[PDB]
Amino acid sequence: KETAAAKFERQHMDSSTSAASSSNYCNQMMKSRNLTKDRCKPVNTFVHESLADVQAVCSQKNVACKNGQTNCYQSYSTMSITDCRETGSSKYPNCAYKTTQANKHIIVACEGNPYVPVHFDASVSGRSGRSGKETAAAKFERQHMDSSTSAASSSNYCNQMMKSRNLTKDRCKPVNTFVHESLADVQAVCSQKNVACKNGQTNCYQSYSTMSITDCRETGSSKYPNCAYKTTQANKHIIVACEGNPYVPVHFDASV
């Protein structure tokens, strides 16, 4: 029995190729992946990224699913995708498709433990005006949350994450901390130990418990655009600034 996760891989993942280079890509892929077995599936999207990269989207920008559920996630980065759309002349079983390559953000629905993609909801570009505003809370999640892993596993973690979370775009952000706990656990800190922030404001809170965090700090030899970081894994209490309704983290003040 095919699980939802496996079905998503069959229907939507093509890591073998970095992009469609043939107008016959969809014709071939829709067939080989069994998307034309009982009928010509009208439309389908294939993602040309690693499975790791796509699974990672499950811990990226939380957005409402088209069906009204809340378990959808929009990729921080644009990804190589290929849209397949059945041609007007297409007739089962000879299902025919137009192949269109693009680079857009993807939106996937995620479920399970581990938390993995189970549906492809949409693709969105910044040029379309639909990628959306980034709230302070969402920016905090992008810069400071990594719920996908329990801890930094390798010395290249920061090199990878600083780039993928878009913290090396125009320059190398020198220092940044990622938190390896559930979003629920981190949001809960806003009701924990009230303390002054470094800036003298008093909307900061120290987590009661130590948390798994990774400190990323630029090396002495690092130079934009080739930003290099040292990765340090640690268990510390975090201090966040909280704001708004709901009252949620909007800044990472320190770890102690």
Same domain, 120 and 153: no
- Is-contact 107 124, C-beta < 8 A? yes
Catalytic pick from 48, 105, 119, 180?
119
- Is-contact 95 40, C-beta < 8 A? yes
Active-site annotation holds for 12? yes
Catalytic pick from 12, 48, 105, 180?
12
Same domain, 1 and 104: yes
∠ CA 60-182-237, nearest 5°, is 115
Domain's final residue, options 110, 126, 142: 126
Method: X-ray
Query: Which residues fall in the annotated binding site for substrate?
Result: 7, 10, 41-45, 66, 85, 139, 142, 173-177, 198, 217
Question: In whole angstroms, what separates CA 51 from the centre of its chain?
Answer: 12
Same domain, 140 and 26: no
Active-site annotation holds for 251? yes
- Give Cβ neighbours of residue 48 (< 8 Å, ≥ 6 apart): 14, 15, 17, 18, 19, 20, 79, 80, 81, 82
Same domain, 141 and 226: yes
Burial 13-40 (b: 16+ CB within 10 A, else e): bbeeeeebeeeebbbebbbebebbeeeb
Same domain, 162 and 87: no
- Is-contact 118 8, C-beta < 8 A? yes
- Is-contact 34 44, C-beta < 8 A? no
Residue carrying structure tokens 């809960």: 188
Entry resolution in angstroms?
Answer: 1.7
Catalytic pick from 48, 105, 180, 251?
251
Same domain, 133 and 254: yes
DSSP state of 242: E
Query: Which residues fall in the annotated binding site?
Result: 7, 10, 41-45, 66, 85, 139, 142, 173-177, 198, 217
Same domain, 55 and 154: no
| Number of structural domains found in the chain | 2
Domain span at 51: 1-126
